[PDB]
Amino acid sequence: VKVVKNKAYYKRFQVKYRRRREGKTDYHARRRMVLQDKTKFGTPKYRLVVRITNRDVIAQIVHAKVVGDEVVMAAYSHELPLFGIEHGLTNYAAAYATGLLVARRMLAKLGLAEKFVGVKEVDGSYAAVRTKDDDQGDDESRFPFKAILDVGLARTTTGARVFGVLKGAVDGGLAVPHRPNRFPGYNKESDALNAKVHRDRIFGRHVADYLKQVREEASSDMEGMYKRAHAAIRADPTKR
């Protein structure tokens, strides 16, 4: 048969980008995420990079540069046991916790704490955060820190843990533009978000029900510690 991969094939071959070969970067989306108005002469633009592995949740704030991307702040799921969560570390509740940590640490670094404290009581309702592009009729007050969500190659479905990290960052004080169309409680028929269903997922009621069912299957608490964890992060986010 005709043999492909001869000498002529290798001479004419053009290799793709290194990170495209490794299957790590979508350069079609990355080009739009870094693009900025030329009338803004190089003013900083930040990204919120969220990557979830088989055993970890990673949240980073990244500023793109020609020499190489620069990471301003990073939070990981394995630092949660220092705050009070020693199980899960991958579930939706851990996604919320790490989003709060990265938002709290970044505001602490900038000195912008004790302002833009976010919400104190946790609820699943929509926020409609304030940005320069679309503000809520107010221009006198100081604007919050802004970043745009970067989910990478993950498939963006309703009630995914990537959008869990987004909610935690918004509740922590960051201004990441978004819509509630992808939150767990959102129903597309009525275009309404069940804040009750959302609130349970943040506090891990779905995990508790499955654990209780599993205990029953073997035969023949979580909400309280999550609340304590949220308080601990909001108190001393720089501990390590």
Binding site: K38, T39, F41
Partner: protein, 151 residues
């Protein structure tokens, strides 16, 4: 006299390269332009939007206007017995920063550095000198090389 459209002699002019096809990279996206800069106008041929006319490929000019996704450049063009200053609007992908003044700027930086050091050189081959060979060969046009030029 037939068929003089916007892109007439552009088969090889707007061709990309050998083993260098694709779309502009991040380094191109992050370039900053400001009014008064010198730029080169080269087409990319992978971006159809905002591509200049074939005359302005390879030309160098100065920028007069910055827009959210575009740059305005002033370029000279001789018409009959005069040169007209033309203005073209192109996208930022078909524009590169020009290095036509780095030698001049480096000269200015050296001059101030020389004055700064003075406040706080070369060997001429043209002039003669002694030469000691220690060996001398001869060129004689041997008959062997005459026989060599026979394919």
């Amino acid at each position: 006299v037939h068929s003089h459209g916007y892109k007439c002699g552009t088969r090889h002019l707007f061709a990309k390269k050998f083993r260098k096809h694709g779309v502009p990279s991040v380094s191109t996206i992050l370039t900053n332009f400001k009014v008064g800069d010198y730029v080169d106008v080269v087409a990319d041929a992978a971006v159809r939007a905002g591509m200049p006319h074939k005359y302005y490929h390879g030309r160098t000019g100065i920028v007069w206007n910055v827009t959210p996704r575009g740059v305005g450049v002033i370029i000279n063009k001789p018409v009959r017995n005069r040169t007209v200053r033309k203005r073209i609007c192109v996208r930022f992908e078909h524009v590169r920063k020009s290095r036509c003044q780095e030698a001049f700027k480096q000269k200015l930086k050296d001059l101030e550095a020389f004055r700064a050091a003075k406040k706080a050189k070369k060997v001429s081959t043209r002039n003669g000198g002694f030469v000691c060979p220690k060996k001398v060969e001869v060129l004689a046009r041997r008959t062997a090389d005459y026989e060599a030029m026979i394919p």
